[PDB]
Amino acid sequence: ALTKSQTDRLEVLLNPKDEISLNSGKPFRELESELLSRRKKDLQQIYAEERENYLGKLEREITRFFVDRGFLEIKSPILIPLEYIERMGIDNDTELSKQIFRVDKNFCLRPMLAPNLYNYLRKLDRALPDPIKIFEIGPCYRKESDGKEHLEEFTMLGFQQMGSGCTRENLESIITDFLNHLGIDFKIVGGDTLDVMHGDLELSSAGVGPIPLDREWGIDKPWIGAGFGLERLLKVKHDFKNIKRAARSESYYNGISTNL
Amino acid sequence: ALTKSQTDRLEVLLNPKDEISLNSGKPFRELESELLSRRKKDLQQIYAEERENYLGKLEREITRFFVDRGFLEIKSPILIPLEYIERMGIDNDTELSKQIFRVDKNFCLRPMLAPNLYNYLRKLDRALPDPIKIFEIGPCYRKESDGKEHLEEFTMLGFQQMGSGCTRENLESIITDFLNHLGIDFKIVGGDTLDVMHGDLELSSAGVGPIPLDREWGIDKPWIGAGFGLERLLKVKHDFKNIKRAARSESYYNGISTNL
Ligand SMILES: Nc1ncnc2c1ncn2[C@@H]1O[C@H](COP(=O)(O)OP(=O)(O)NP(=O)(O)O)[C@@H](O)[C@H]1O
Ligand SMILES: Nc1ncnc2c1ncn2[C@@H]1O[C@H](COP(=O)(O)OP(=O)(O)NP(=O)(O)O)[C@@H](O)[C@H]1O
Ligand SMILES: N[C@@H](Cc1cccc(Br)c1)C(=O)O
Ligand SMILES: N[C@@H](Cc1cccc(Br)c1)C(=O)O
Ligand SMILES: [Mg+2]
Ligand SMILES: [Mg+2]
Ligand SMILES: [Mg+2]
Ligand SMILES: [Mg+2]
């Protein structure tokens, strides 16, 4: 009979599409040697043929999707002023105040893209024709309790449109086209606030402005937008049981264990 | 006569290929209105035609270059254990100890890619055929004195090959092909340590292993590698006078000022 620790070891080596049962009568050492062999071949194949990282390649696919649809690709600072968090309405009554990675006296790792997107919307409105369509992909940081759905270091897609055409229908059409393009099943459940759900997993929270917070950021126009976690998308796409398989990590490469 | 502050304002609005002299007899207000008009059209053009961010697009070009040459694309944690810094030999006698952005009791923002690359080399050597070729592009953080060549938040390309073919000649051929592909003039000046210089600007430091540090990381094979700052590459390519034009930023979009 396999010990719980032995079973832990084998599941780190197991692939979702693997069709091997750790409940058969085969000893640990051979089940382990079997899976080690498969995982080395998986990496050998990636090394020989494609060589692209899941998270990098997804960011590039999401980028071409939004560029082709008219959204300006933004790359803004990850290390942001702590004041941006207060100006987002994040008091201490909210959960997210406890979750901030502080850096100096006045800085933090950004837990969200909304402050920088807001700032880009305000500035670009003096130069670009209506509507203004932007998006960003990059790291975000939140302190979290251990979760199969939460990382402390993750990657956020955020997009936002300001001005004409900022309706909920249009926002749902963007979400729908986007996840149908990626091959990710979802349901949309719900100014407006809506969530994009995969079963009980939140893929995205989206929103329809104007909202009173906009005033603090110099925004006085309608808008629509959404944020998606890239690792959650990978988790669903590749059927990973734990989101750590999809993270920036030294433990996993494209969901294959690197401890062989 | 233009004040120094007025001239500061105009140079923020000026483009390297702009052919306007702030030393002519035209008043501030019209020189400013002239340049505002140009910069809005530059952004309008980007918005209408291509919409890709300089830093994102360069990362994608560098990625295809190294993937096509057989290097495995790595994305490893940006937030790393503080112990990785000591194990890199970064004592307090080195400059770099003072430059670390500490995060909790035990973490920091990575100032370099070498620890994670080292860890990937060790683990992948149990699975991949010789030679092992990896690379990574992503954020790095260092506290710096105000410089026209230094950002506190920048982007590093790092690549490393381990095993056979790890000669200085091969390392220079990779560097040479890479910068000729990008259209960036350079000179290489110099186990071995070499620098890739553009005038007095350091594009890259490279190295040839084995070196005694390798032992601490579980590496006992020869290697070659180099690190390049992406913003420095953009600075040279686009002839920016100050590296802030190329940074993750809310002040500049593809080197065009966003304060119009
Ligand atoms: N810790 C995290 N790890 C991975 N993805 C995350 C994390 N926090 C947020 N996301 C993703 O970012 C999206 C937008 O952020 P947000 O709406 O603020 O998340 P949230 O409300 O905190 N979701 P949740 O914590 O699961 O209830 C989420 O829907 C997730 O896709
Ligand atoms: N603060 C920074 N801002 C931008 N690029 C940087 C920064 N620090 C390092 N780089 C880039 O990363 C490369 C590899 O890092 P490293 O060799 O450690 O730099 P370095 O020796 O500190 N160079 P320098 O500080 O200019 O004398 C450098 O050659 C630069 O291209
Ligand atoms: N609140 C998260 C997700 C996000 C991003 C952009 C627009 C919208 Br609406 C929601 C964040 O600020 O990144
Ligand atoms: N020292 C910097 C640059 C670098 C990266 C990889 C290999 C080599 Br050699 C140099 C860093 O560690 O990122
Ligand atoms: Mg949360
Ligand atoms: Mg939410
Ligand atoms: Mg330095
Ligand atoms: Mg150097």
Author numbering:
A (entry chain A), B (entry chain A): 189 to 378, 385 to 454
Copy text verbatim from the article accompanying this structure deposition.
We here report a novel, polyspecific Methanosarcina mazei PylRS mutant, DFRS2, capable of incorporating DFAs into proteins via ribosomal synthesis in vivo. Seeing that the poorly soluble PylRS N-terminal domain is not essential for amino acid activation, we employed a truncated form of DFRS2, DFRSc (residues 185-454), in our ATP-PPi exchange assays. We continued to determine the crystal structures of the DFRSc in complex with adenylyl-imidodiphosphate (AMP-PNP) and each of the six ncAAs 1-6 at 1.8–2.5 Å resolution. That is, D- and L-3-trifluoromethylphenylalanine (1 and 2); D- and L-3-chlorophenylalanine (3 and 4); and D- and L-3-bromophenylalanine (5 and 6).
Clear and well-defined electron density maps were also obtained from complexes between LFAs (2, 4, and 6) and DFRSc, exhibiting similar binding modes. We observed in the structures of LFA (2, 4, or 6)-bound DFRSc complexes that the carboxyl groups of LFAs form hydrogen bonds with residues L310 and A302 of DFRSc. Results indicated DFRS2 to display prominent aminoacylation activity with LFAs 2, 4, and 6, exhibiting K M of 0.09 ± 0.012, 0.05 ± 0.004, and 0.12 ± 0.010 mM, respectively. Our results revealed the K M of DFRSc to LFA 4 (5.38 ± 1.28 mM) to be lower than those to LFAs 2 (7.12 ± 1.67 mM) and 6 (9.80 ± 1.65 mM), whereas the k cat of DFRSc with LFAs 2, 4, and 6 (10.43 ± 0.37, 11.18 ± 0.29, and 10.21 ± 0.35 s-1 × 10−2, respectively) were similar. The relative aminoacylation efficiencies of DFRS2 with the ncAAs were then calculated based on the k cat/K M of PylRS with BocK, indicating the catalytic efficiency of DFRS2 with LFAs to be 1.2 to 2.3 folds higher, and contrastingly, those with DFAs to be 20 to 59 folds lower than PylRS with BocK.
